[PDB]
Amino acid sequence: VPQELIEKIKLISPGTELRKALDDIINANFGALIFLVDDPKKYEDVIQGGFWLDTDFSAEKLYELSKMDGAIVLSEDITKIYYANVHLVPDPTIPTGETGTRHRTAERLAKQTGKVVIAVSRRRNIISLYYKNYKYVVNQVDFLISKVTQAISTLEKYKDNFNKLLSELEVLELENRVTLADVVRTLAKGFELLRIVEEIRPYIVELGEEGRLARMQLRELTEDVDDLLVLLIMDYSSEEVEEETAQNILQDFITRREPSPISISRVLGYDVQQAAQLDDVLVSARGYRLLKTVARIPLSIGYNVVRMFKTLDQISKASVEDLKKVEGIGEKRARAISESISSLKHRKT
Template sequence: MTDEFLSKLKLIAPGTPIRQGVDDILNAHGGALIVFAEDYKKHPLTFQVGFHLNEDFSPQRLYELAKMDGAIVLNDEGEKILAANTHLIPDPSIPSEETGTRHRSAERIARQFNKLVIAISRRRKTITVYYGSEKHVIGDVISLMNKVNQALNTYEKYRQSFDKLLLQLDIAELEGSVTLREVCEILERAALAMKIEEEARRYLIELGTEGRLSKLTLDEMSEGVEDTVNLLILDYYNGDPDECDPETVRERLKNLPEKELLGFLSVARALNYDVSSSQQLGDVTVESHGFRILRRDSKIPMNIVTNVVRAFGTLERISQASLDQLKKVEGIGETRAAAIRRTIEMKKRQNAVQG
């Protein structure tokens, strides 16, 4: 489902005026065909209008007009009812897998004009949404809430695993004992979590106001994950970090099939490592550039962090730098240099205690 289609689904999510009107029609055992096409007058052969309206949208008006035959035409934002009792004659050569007349017309109109079309089935008691070549049957609120809760539970498990592995990485980084396999495992957990988050947010769009509490829960659980992943990618990218676009790599990881993620090999290749087998990953030792610790723990602005990494190259060299050496970096004064030293020393003490 494309982002554009998801944005269209927001128009008919629970809590919106359009959804109220659609639910009223469905609950009254009615059917309807609703087309969002404010330029319908440009296509008189396709849109043979019974009568023009140009009235403000209201759920009650939609409900009453659905009692008549023909489609109801709204503007693209769903704020105006433009026409009703409209006979649709789409291009018959456009392929359609639908069997019912209403749904077949809806699919063809959506494909022909790249418009949003809603088909409400009296017999099936379903709401089907078409947009361009995409189609989606709206689920009932209870089923969607069950899917969201399942997704939240799964996300929580991945997030807990991700956080645990990050703590282990903090220890290994300053000891200089990080392997490529460990980095790939962390990014694999993050990618799986982001996949689940994306799925949950699709359900939440359909739920509208019914999913507001679940949305707050997901927002809280997912806070900081994408930023942390971006910093991890910069830390362990095999090459000049200036040539790495972490957001592009992150999206690539998120879009990898789950089977490829679990093998870690595709994760390593996304970080620009030339590896031919998963067995190699545990033998390759890697060094952090220091982005994550400087940005997350020392709270230094990202542009200044970049300057520090350019000056020293790796976290190990940063940890060995004196205050005077740090202050030679553009943007690093006495306060920030001291903050970097405190962060490094604190991490070392924590590692010693945990060790």
């Protein structure tokens, strides 16, 4: 969905004065055909009859004017109402995939002029926006809320399982009994969870001001999910991998590529063929996740710790004295790493 169009959609999103007017128009079952231009004098050829108003915009004014037949012409920034009750006459030879007279007119005018044309039928209750060669159907708030409420409820489900898999992996990680299947199963759930967020994003945008609460909910549910997945990738990829590269792996499975067991393992650097092989492949976390999220060690210093101890298993056996031998680790950080890991081991295993 082109960005140029996304901006135009904002013009009619819940919260704007124009959308308030369109909502009342729909409710009154009046139709509507709105043409948005900047310089009215240049379109006199496609604008016939009607009344020249050239007055300041207002939701009530638009609504009242919509009682008359014909189209309304507004300024692109929605600050002025130039015409009302006019006949829009774009070239009738321009191809169109619409059925209604006003929608055929709308599409053709949008294509012919490259400007925004809004069409609202008397019968249905959807706002059809046309811009250049694009067409975007804007849905009613109640329809959007219903879809978004279901999606969020679906996300809670996915998140719940994600948390379960993660607490399981934690135990195994602390006991150094992880297999590639444990890692993949965890990453897959997290990938699917974030895809849900991606697919739902357009409805959220479409909700405008009516999507505040929905945004807050998605935020609480997915807060540190992405960082956590990037860290698992850094901890279990077959070869040392940078953060930026891990952030790119995440991005790939959240959109482009499908998160299947064999595929994730493959991308992680494991020449695997059968999904069943995963349970046989043993792996040990590098230690980044625990160091950053629990010990609060910046990845930069993290790399140093890993470079010396190799795995979380070794790191967990090191002493403060040992940990201090690492660059970037003073008495404070060594004590944090050591104590936080020891604390987790005693409580989780």
